Amino acid sequence: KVYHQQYQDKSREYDQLYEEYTRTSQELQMKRTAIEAFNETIKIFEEQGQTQEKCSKEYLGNEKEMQRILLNSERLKSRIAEIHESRTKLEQDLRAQASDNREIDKRMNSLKPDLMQLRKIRDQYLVWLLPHHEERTWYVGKINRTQAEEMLSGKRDGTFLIRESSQRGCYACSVVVDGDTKHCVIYRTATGFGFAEPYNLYGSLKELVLHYQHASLVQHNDALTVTLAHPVRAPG
Amino acid sequence: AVDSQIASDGAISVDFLLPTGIYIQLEVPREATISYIKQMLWKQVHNYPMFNLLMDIDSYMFACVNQTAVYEELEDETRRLCDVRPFLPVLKLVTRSCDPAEKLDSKIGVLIGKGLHEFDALKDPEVNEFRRKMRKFSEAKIQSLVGLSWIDWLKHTYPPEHEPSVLENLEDKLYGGKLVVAVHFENSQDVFSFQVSPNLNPIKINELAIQKRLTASPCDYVLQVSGRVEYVFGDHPLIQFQYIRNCVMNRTLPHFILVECCKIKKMYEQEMIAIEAAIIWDNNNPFQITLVKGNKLNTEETVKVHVRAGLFHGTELLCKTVVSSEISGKNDHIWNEQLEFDINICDLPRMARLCFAVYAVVAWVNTMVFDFKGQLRSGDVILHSWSSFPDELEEMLNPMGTVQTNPYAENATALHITFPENKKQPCYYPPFDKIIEKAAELAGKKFLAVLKEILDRDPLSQLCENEMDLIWTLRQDCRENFPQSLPKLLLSIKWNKLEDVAQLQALLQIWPKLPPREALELLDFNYPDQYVREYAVGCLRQMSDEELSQYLLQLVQVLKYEPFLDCALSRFLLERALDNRRIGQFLFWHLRSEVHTPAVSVQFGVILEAYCRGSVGHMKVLSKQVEALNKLKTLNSLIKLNAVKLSRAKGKEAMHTCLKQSAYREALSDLQSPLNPCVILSELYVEKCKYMDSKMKPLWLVYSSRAFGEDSVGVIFKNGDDLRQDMLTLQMLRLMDLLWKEAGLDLRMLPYGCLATGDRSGLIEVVSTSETIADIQLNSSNVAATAAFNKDALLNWLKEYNSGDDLDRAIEEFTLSCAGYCVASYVLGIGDRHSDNIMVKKTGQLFHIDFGHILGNFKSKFGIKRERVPFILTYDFIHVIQQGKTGNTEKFGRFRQCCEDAYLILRRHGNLFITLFALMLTAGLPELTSVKDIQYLKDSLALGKSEEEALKQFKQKFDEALRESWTTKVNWMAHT
Numbered sequence A: 001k002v003y004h005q006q007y008q009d010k011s012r013e014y015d016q017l018y019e020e021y022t023r024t025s026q027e028l029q030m031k032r033t034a035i036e037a038f039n040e041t042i043k044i045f046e047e048q049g050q051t052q053e054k055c056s057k058e059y060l061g062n063e064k065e066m067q068r069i070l071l072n073s074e075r076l077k078s079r080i081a082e083i084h085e086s087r088t089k090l091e092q093d094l095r096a097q098a099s100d101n102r103e104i105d106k107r108m109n110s111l112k113p114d115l116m117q118l119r120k121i122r123d124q125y126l127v128w129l130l131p132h133h134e135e136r137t138w139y140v141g142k143i144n145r146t147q148a149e150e151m152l153s154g155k156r157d158g159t160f161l162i163r164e165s166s167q168r169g170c171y172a173c174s175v176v177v178d179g180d181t182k183h184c185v186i187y188r189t190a191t192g193f194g195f196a197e198p199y200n201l202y203g204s205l206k207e208l209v210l211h212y213q214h215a216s217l218v219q220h221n222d223a224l225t226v227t228l229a230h231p232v233r234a235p236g
Numbered sequence B: 001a002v003d004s005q006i007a008s009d010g011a012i013s014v015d016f017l018l019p020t021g022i023y024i025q026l027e028v029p030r031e032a033t034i035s036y037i038k039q040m041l042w043k044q045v046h047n048y049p050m051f052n053l054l055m056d057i058d059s060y061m062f063a064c065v066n067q068t069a070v071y072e073e074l075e076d077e078t079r080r081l082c083d084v085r086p087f088l089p090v091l092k093l094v095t096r097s098c099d100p101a102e103k104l105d106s107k108i109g110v111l112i113g114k115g116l117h118e119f120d121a122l123k124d125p126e127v128n129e130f131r132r133k134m135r136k137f138s139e140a141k142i143q144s145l146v147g148l149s150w151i152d153w154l155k156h157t158y159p160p161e162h163e164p165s166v167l168e169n170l171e172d173k174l175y176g177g178k179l180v181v182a183v184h185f186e187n188s189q190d191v192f193s194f195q196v197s198p199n200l201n202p203i204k205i206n207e208l209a210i211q212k213r214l215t216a217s218p219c220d221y222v223l224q225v226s227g228r229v230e231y232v233f234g235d236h237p238l239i240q241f242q243y244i245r246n247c248v249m250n251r252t253l254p255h256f257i258l259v260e261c262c263k264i265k266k267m268y269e270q271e272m273i274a275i276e277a278a279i280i281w282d283n284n285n286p287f288q289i290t291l292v293k294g295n296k297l298n299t300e301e302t303v304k305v306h307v308r309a310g311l312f313h314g315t316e317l318l319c320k321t322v323v324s325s326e327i328s329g330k331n332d333h334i335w336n337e338q339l340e341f342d343i344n345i346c347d348l349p350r351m352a353r354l355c356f357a358v359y360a361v362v363a364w365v366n367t368m369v370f371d372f373k374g375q376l377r378s379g380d381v382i383l384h385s386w387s388s389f390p391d392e393l394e395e396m397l398n399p400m401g402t403v404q405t406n407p408y409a410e411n412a413t414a415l416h417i418t419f420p421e422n423k424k425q426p427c428y429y430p431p432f433d434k435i436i437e438k439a440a441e442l443a444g445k446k447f448l449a450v451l452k453e454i455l456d457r458d459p460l461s462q463l464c465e466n467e468m469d470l471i472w473t474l475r476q477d478c479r480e481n482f483p484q485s486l487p488k489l490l491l492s493i494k495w496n497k498l499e500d501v502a503q504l505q506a507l508l509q510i511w512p513k514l515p516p517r518e519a520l521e522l523l524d525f526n527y528p529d530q531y532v533r534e535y536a537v538g539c540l541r542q543m544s545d546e547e548l549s550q551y552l553l554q555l556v557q558v559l560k561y562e563p564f565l566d567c568a569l570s571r572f573l574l575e576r577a578l579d580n581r582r583i584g585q586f587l588f589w590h591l592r593s594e595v596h597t598p599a600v601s602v603q604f605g606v607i608l609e610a611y612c613r614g615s616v617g618h619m620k621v622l623s624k625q626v627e628a629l630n631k632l633k634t635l636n637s638l639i640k641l642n643a644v645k646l647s648r649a650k651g652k653e654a655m656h657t658c659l660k661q662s663a664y665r666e667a668l669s670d671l672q673s674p675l676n677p678c679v680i681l682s683e684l685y686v687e688k689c690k691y692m693d694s695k696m697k698p699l700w701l702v703y704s705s706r707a708f709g710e711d712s713v714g715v716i717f718k719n720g721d722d723l724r725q726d727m728l729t730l731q732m733l734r735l736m737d738l739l740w741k742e743a744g745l746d747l748r749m750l751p752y753g754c755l756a757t758g759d760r761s762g763l764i765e766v767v768s769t770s771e772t773i774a775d776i777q778l779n780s781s782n783v784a785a786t787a788a789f790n791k792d793a794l795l796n797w798l799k800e801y802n803s804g805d806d807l808d809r810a811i812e813e814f815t816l817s818c819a820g821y822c823v824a825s826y827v828l829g830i831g832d833r834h835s836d837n838i839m840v841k842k843t844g845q846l847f848h849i850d851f852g853h854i855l856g857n858f859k860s861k862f863g864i865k866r867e868r869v870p871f872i873l874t875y876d877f878i879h880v881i882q883q884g885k886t887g888n889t890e891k892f893g894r895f896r897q898c899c900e901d902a903y904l905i906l907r908r909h910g911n912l913f914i915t916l917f918a919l920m921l922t923a924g925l926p927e928l929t930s931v932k933d934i935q936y937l938k939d940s941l942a943l944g945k946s947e948e949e950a951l952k953q954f955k956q957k958f959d960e961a962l963r964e965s966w967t968t969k970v971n972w973m974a975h976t
């Protein structure tokens, strides 16, 4: 009777299994490498047993060398001993790590179809296959910096009241920075509007304002800090 | 504890197995010279019986078992005991003159990391059938090498690189026609300069070279590139040689050394000295398979039992998902059942793949219906399954997975199966000729419009039945107008019946050869046929070694896919690698990098020895490197340890002293770069070698190319990380640079060298005079250290190293390289790029560095997830392009032009990208897991939409980044 509640926490249970398995399988080929090496070392010691027995039959003085050789065959016998035990203890640890990895495929492959069953519910989950918004709130038509500084002085340290530039068919932006009012030129171009050439792709002087309340002025000038939180017509 | 390499200092108790069986144990210092030990043992030899049946020290040499079960005959008596870490302390003193050419078989097993006996230990026919097949051919090449006179040998060992008409795009980056080339004689201290036509033959430089009054034929001399085993000679124009082309292209001075024939003769003779060390169809009935028991103890709550079957030919299924009899899914595993296969035995593809699994709701084995010689697999066969190895998506039964079974028996799954062995005379595949006779017996200007709209849709896009029908219907018409459509056609017909198959095979022979770039598709999962593949490579066989080296990575990954061993691809790759320009080395290196992994261990292992064998000469150099790399691994291991108890600057010293020691300065010095086979390595500039701040503390090796090489080389050895994503994304970048230059666009890109040499090991190549943009920014007086720490730091940087005229090229090279990277990044969906991973050379060139994730978002292995990588631009790039110059429309416009142009060029070869990323599925990358992954490209490249419908999309994406130009600039290093 259960539907969509969560997923993310049980999803990561696969890696809680896979992160240790990959390390374990890696250690198992590594542990098998040594048994191959161990089983190959023995082969050389085994060859020694043959040679010491064949080379010893060479008695072509013979009484004192009967025991000196015997001793060395019996020490060489005792080396292949501890190295058969040393190999067996590693062979026992392979059997252990390998058994543990089988009890993990018992956990790994049991949680894999949970996502396969989820497919019918999961893929069917379907439905689909701001005070600057007013023009006059920041626009102040034909003005001069003198008349711009006038209004803005006394207002908060982040207000927008944009004039029109001294320059023929341009615009300007009079802004109260954290300290006082600063005025920059906003430009017209076929590409749109904006303070500087590669960065003036704004269709309207309003969509610009709307995309500079989020973004800082700092790029165009280090001096021009604060963005635009308040235009004109504050509550209360 | 599994090997002696951890923090320990003193002597070690080693066993000395004499030829007379005299066992002797002696405590010998750990870091002792193997000759010092040989001498040491010799002292006590007499206090032990049989002291007289021995010869002198110098007639005997030690032998051991490596950390890899290999019997290591130690000729080089100068190696430290620990520098040749024997698995067990034991050393068998053998006679130096143990000449049975099993001393060769030692030398080989050692290089590879698999002892040759292991192939005999498999006892399975094919391994031996093919080791012996290749050995015949490998030894034919060794024999080809013996006759050859001087210079002709060079053409076989290090052949010069040719590149016709690449200049018919970009012309004369030379003062007039005249090329400026530099030459000096062998051990000469004085160089000479020449003004030369780029259209002349190298012989003119030799004629000019002899014009030095100091009192031989120009032909008795050869032009070797100064600091590389790279040679330039032959009846060809100077510009045609890739070397010259590059110097021309990057306004660099071609550096040549003149070698007297007798010096190359000398090398040839010393190599030939070592070369001497070479001492039924008519069975109209249904097909069905009988099987017996399984072997699982595994228990499940919601569902009890598990058992499945079914058979395919690539992706295409030929039967329904056949189930089986229910036993005890919590206890009893033994059973028997006759498995129903509603398919005739006559209409069966010789490349048919019988697949098996169980009810996952759990292991799998997939084994082929036919064998190495196309004999119907029949009789009792054991199938060693892959438990907990199935991928998340497989279409019930997995058809993709290997036909080569699990190496483990104990505590690793298996399966019992029998096939119709019945008759004393068996059933073999219909001959390579008889299927053409089957077709001969069986015997569109309007459509031109329709099928162009069908035979276009990208390799990953799979056709719907009706399309398939028309493709087969109008098959002769498309053969004549759309030859490039056979990949689509080869998938149109169901491989279920022989009549169509015959007609299809007939077509291939009478079908023209597609280009190598195109042919590559015919080597993925879609096309498993032994004759399409034989033709696919057919086309590759007609490609340059330089073009070959390009698609080599994924060609090696197709060897991983291959179901057999004696395939045309292996035969081709070895045929090519045995005649290498530098091919053989990468072929060899790429193979070891994976021989460590079970499923490929036999595969690559065999191929590897088959190379080593045909490479009896060069063998020394490859080993020189293997030793060079191991020494690095350890020094790094010690570097990790040091870093804890050592100061950043004290651990540097530690590293420096370690390098300065007898063992290091010998091993990892004066023996050829693995990254570039031509690049010589020579003396280390120790004082300048370092290790990185990173979690794996990677080494930074600087190689002062002594006297001859103009400047220094710089390598990065990194052990602990998967260096394969980089290795592939860097190769992808090399392609984009290829394609753009092809179309006509040198965006001055830097896909710097990268090779993963093993398991989480490998090398990155260092780019000279470079710097991280984070590095450039901090440690600079940011506009008199007053405002915005970022702005113009990157500009002043360039200004510092570029004087007047130079500043223009610098910013010019900055722009297009930035443009080139901006596109290539987005397109390949390279994520989480920050000023810490973007870099700038002192030439102005820009480039990328930490390729953690591609074709989706970067999330660590624990929680690996995907996200669309948007196009990104930083304020910092624009600012430089601009120069800070408040208003323009020619430089930040030149940028956008390039950006657009580039994006459009990639779109055209979008299929080439999707094909390579598709062949790279086998490789096993954490990212490339499925065809759902390659599907990212289709979107990034806007592969459905037309050029201008798709340009408009990107034209918008690019502008939207100019909107987030400071916004992204912030994300690059604010918190970072």
Ligand SMILES: CS(=O)(=O)N1CCN(Cc2cc3nc(-c4cccc5[nH]ncc45)nc(N4CCOCC4)c3s2)CC1
Pocket (backbone or CB within 6 Å): B690, B691, B692, B693, B694, B700, B726, B752, B764, B765, B766, B767, B768, B770, B772, B849, B850, B851
């Ligand atoms: C002095 S310090 O080295 O200890 N320290 C740590 C890092 N350094 C900056 C650099 C990091 C860096 N990482 C990489 C890399 C990292 C991980 C994976 C990779 N794939 N490719 C490169 C690379 N590739 C690099 N090269 C550069 C040029 O040639 C090319 C590479 C550089 S340069 C400076 C401060």
